[PDB]
Design a protein around this ligand. Structure first.
Ligand SMILES: Cc1cc2nc3c(=O)[nH]c(=O)nc-3n(C[C@H](O)[C@H](O)[C@H](O)COP(=O)(O)OP(=O)(O)OC[C@H]3O[C@@H](n4cnc5c(N)ncnc54)[C@H](O)[C@@H]3O)c2cc1C
Ligand SMILES: O=C(O)CSC[C@@]1(O)OC[C@@H](O)[C@@H](O)[C@@H]1O
Length: 436
């Protein structure tokens, strides 16, 4: 019974909240408000990054899960390739996907499905890896690396610039963004007569809405009982700034990715900075409540654990050893939230009639920026196809008996899901306000 002018409220102006705002606006809605405790682009948004990988990789070997993920990935790629708003930010550089151990290579097979793509080049010798870039870039020995190179049809997007472009387009189409603290910091949803009626912000403003979308990423569990469906989990990233004289050499290189070591990208234009991530199964931040119950609580930090730095420099030694001792120009932790099987959680709430969930991006949601809003709007409108709905629906049963330490098909570092409570030392990198 929504009209196009019904008050709609989105909690979170991150990747999926912004996508939702954009798609509501495109679909004719004229009374949408988005709330976020940070200015766009949010400093705690996982999407606020100079690059993200865009590729069609799979996360399951189950036929039904593969089919649904293919549908959603095709829609996202369509956006990056064909939507004038998103095309500017996508760079089809190609992508190397690799591993080292037998367990890693098994996982690589599931992810890459090399038998389905004759275009992939198989790499098994160090010289083959070095030849992916001009002489002097990939100087390392790539010890034990084996993988598959996609020459095109995969690459990277300028995540921050795409996020900002989408928000600014939503805004010019009439979406209200209320950002910053306290005005955009939601402190509770409004619970009235067994429904959610909107939200209250930290400035003590009451925001009533006909429908509320919860798109708060790793923080979503603060607001609602997810019945153990979400595990807030964090990853680590650094930048190294190349000198102006050395930047040309590194331009246009493919994304280099080993699922047991880490990955990096060509340098950004603004600062000539290479972004590097050490791969691992993630950090939780498990706190015990007065109940004695367990929950992972996100926090902002513009540093990484020293152990993460060690893993980054180890990766660089194997690939770009000439850079392995360079000081970092930027470092941060980056949060998302994993469902029990890393499938998305996009549905109407089963009891709260007015609430729509758009979360559980499971550390792989950025690439859906162009498209995921359509699916979240479909959920509000009741238009999700049964096939897709079955995979992404509200699902407490999959999260019952939950193992919080499940590595969920990820590898690297200690091959354990770690915890920030175990971290004793952090880096000392210069602060940068990425909300600009
Ligand atoms: C290091 C790293 C690398 C990654 N690499 C890739 C990749 O290569 N490719 C890919 O596809 N994905 C990648 N991902 C995953 C991807 O970034 C996330 O899955 C995706 O961005 C999550 O989107 P989201 O909208 O759910 O959350 P976010 O974009 O994090 O947005 C959550 C929003 O909630 C807001 N919020 C928090 N508290 C409140 C509050 N109290 N009130 C209102 N709003 C609030 C926050 O300010 C934030 O803006 C990566 C993630 C990380 C951390
Ligand atoms: O979706 C992709 O193609 C890359 S996600 C990159 C990454 O850093 O995202 C965060 C976590 O899911 C990590 O395991 C993972 O390697």
């Amino acid at each position: 019974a929504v009209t196009k002018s019904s008050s709609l409220l989105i909690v979170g102006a991150g990747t999926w909240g912004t996508s939702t705002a954009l798609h509501l606006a495109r679909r004719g809605y004229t009374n949408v408000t988005v709330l976020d405790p940070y200015p766009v682009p949010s400093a705690i948004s996982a999407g606020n990054d100079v690059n993200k990988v865009i590729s069609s990789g799979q996360y399951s070997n189950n036929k039904d899960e593969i089919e649904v993920n293919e549908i959603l990935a095709e829609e996202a790629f369509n956006g990056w390739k064909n939507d004038p708003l998103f095309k500017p930010y996508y760079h089809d550089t190609g992508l190397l996907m690799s591993a080292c151990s037998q367990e890693g290579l098994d996982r690589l097979g599931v992810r890459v499905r090399p038998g389905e793509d004759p275009n992939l080049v198989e790499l098994t010798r160090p010289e083959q890896f070095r030849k992916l870039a001009p002489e002097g870039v990939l100087q390392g020995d790539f010890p034990g690396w084996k993988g598959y190179f996609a020459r095109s049809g995969a690459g990277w997007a300028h995540a921050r610039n795409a996020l900002v472009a989408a928000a600014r387009e939503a805004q010019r189409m009439g979406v209200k963004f209320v950002t910053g603290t306290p005005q955009g910091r939601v402190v509770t949803l409004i619970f009235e007569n067994n429904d959610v009626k909107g939200a209250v912000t930290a400035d003590g403003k009451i925001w009533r809405a006909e429908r509320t979308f919860l798109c708060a990423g790793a923080s979503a569990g603060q607001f609602l009982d997810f019945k153990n469906q979400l595990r807030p989990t964090a990853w680590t990233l650094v930048h190294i700034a190349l000198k102006p004289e050395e930047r040309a050499l590194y331009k246009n290189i493919p994304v280099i990715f080993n699922i047991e070591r880490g990955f990096f990208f060509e340098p950004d234009e603004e600062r000539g900075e290479i972004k590097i991530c050490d791969e691992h199964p993630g950090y939780t931040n498990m706190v015990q409540s007065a109940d004695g119950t367990m929950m992972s609580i996100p926090f902002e930090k513009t540093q990484i654990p020293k152990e993460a730095e060690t893993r980054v420099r180890a990766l660089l030694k194997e690939t770009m050893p000439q850079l392995a001792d360079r000081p970092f120009s930027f470092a941060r932790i980056c949060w998302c939230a994993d469902t029990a099987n890393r499938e998305f959680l996009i549905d109407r709430h089963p009891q709260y009639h007015s609430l729509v969930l758009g979360c559980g991006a499971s550390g792989r949601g950025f690439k859906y920026l162009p498209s995921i809003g359509n699916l979240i709007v479909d959920a509000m409108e009741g238009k999700v196809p049964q096939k897709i709905h079955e995979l992404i629906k509200w699902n407490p049963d999959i999260a019952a008996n939950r193992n919080w330490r499940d590595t969920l098909g990820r590898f690297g570092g200690p091959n354990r899901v770690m915890d920030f409570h175990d971290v004793k030392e952090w880096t000392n990198v210069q602060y940068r306000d990425i909300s600009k």
